[PDB]
Amino acid sequence: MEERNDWHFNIGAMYEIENVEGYGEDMDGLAEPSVYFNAANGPWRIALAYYQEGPVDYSAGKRGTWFDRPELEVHYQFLENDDFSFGLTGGFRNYGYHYVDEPGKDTANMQRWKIAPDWDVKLTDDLRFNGWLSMYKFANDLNTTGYADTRVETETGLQYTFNETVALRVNYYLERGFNMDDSRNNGEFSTQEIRAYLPLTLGNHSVTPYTRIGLDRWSNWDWQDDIEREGHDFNRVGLFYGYDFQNGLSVSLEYAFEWQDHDEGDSDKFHYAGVGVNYSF
Template sequence: MKKTGLLLGLLLPLSSVQAVETAALEPHQDTTLSTDAALDSSENNDKNQWRKKIGAMIETENVEGQGDKDGAFEPTVYLNMSYGKWDIYGSFYQEDQGVDYSSQNRTDWFDQYELDGHYQFIDDQDYALGLMLGFRNYVWHYEEDGKNSPGNTQRYTIQPDWRVTITPKLSYNGWAALFNYYNHTEGNGYLDKELEGETGLKYAFNDTVALQVNYYLKRGWNLGDSQRGEYAQQEVRAYVPLTFNTWSAGATEVVPYARRTLDTYHYNEDRGVREKETDTRFGLLLNQELPHGFAVSLEYAYELQLHDHIADDAAGKTKYHYTGVGISYSF
């Protein structure tokens, strides 16, 4: 599924500055406010020692009335290792297509293996600048109509991130990623190139309350003349991170957030038109530190999707639900 929450983005090897201030973006490629990046006390440890984090999470996605019936359950397990200015991240993720859990079957699914490396060039009171290089391998499995997988698809990523402190309370921050797909892209339904980024301003009222307002862009295209599957998505996103230290177990972070489409389209090759979509999403992310290096995260999001320039028999309005539950252990 293309729609995801904040939670998995927490797993990526970002600097703590970016993870906190970018505050929650699209997962899997992506980057965000973390279950633990924002809260993890290991950030205060000597950076010249190996710091390791293992974790697991489960995401669910469901569009009401769609053929997936019970929705999709998408598991992730990961390992993140940090040393000095380096972060190394590896994960395994699985996504199902055409799921019916009541009859315990699914049509198609893929296994995703990922390895990323992030280097923090600068991180001081005035500026931060980092760079992530990443690799993904998509292994597709098809069971519908006897279709066989044409082979694996690989994705290579280059992704800078930055922060500029304007005043002690106001900062400008963001990230941008270029994704390059190779091998069997058309057979597995991928585009040749994707560009994704999120950038904006954060204002910290005090140690408890902050406001982040971002512009988000995602664009996918093919090399050559084909418009198959091409799309563009622009959104304004707002986050209100609230941090509390009321429990002896550790800090609590609550992040209400909202997203609103500025302009989004997807090219329907069968109809030869750009189908438009306007999304309004409201969500809530909860991060909680636990004793002995553990942390948990919970997230829920609801999204109303309005569709335009679509086929006569297509639904003009759909309702989408996302949930995520994660646990990690830092040592």
């Protein structure tokens, strides 16, 4: 069965905290290892995972936390076009349990509903643009009020070949706010952020840097007086390395680099490194 590729299986493994860097967090019950299961052959494709979160470590369970959320997502593709330009994503997640109504109210029922269709906005090879709309509901209350309290999220992706030979993925994030200008707002920061990243192929190792800001507000600080230490990175840069295994596994390695070049790599302000494991067959 292993030799045959009739069944397509995907497994993803993630760790919320890794000891590799040597840095951790305050609470244990806020981080655990994760495994994602995906299967598809005939019927549609379904991913199942469980998420347990302990706001208090004492209220977290080593065997299995009674405060638990099931994570379920099923993806649908529809060939109403020559290409699979039509798709639907459905996500089901329950917050808490509704099996019992025992005193104390440690048991509670909140539902998270996700509906997100896939759309190919542009159907041309030279320039591709995509966008997906995701609608979320929570608790019983939002279901009762319906679309009124529904949270709406939209992500859009633009593929432009800057050098023609390589394609750049630019993602635009759309959130619904008041969307009204205010005198209390200086306008220093943009209401939307443009995040751009590209896959660079170096053997079996893929290099994918991303920038928080695709088009920076200014060319530089461009002041006649500069301070070496910046309070925080306005444009954050993350670099992913895809590492290959001869067995047939691929892992994504996270690295964070500061805007200012480091002559001394022996000492860095921040250290963010993470490993994601993907199995696809």
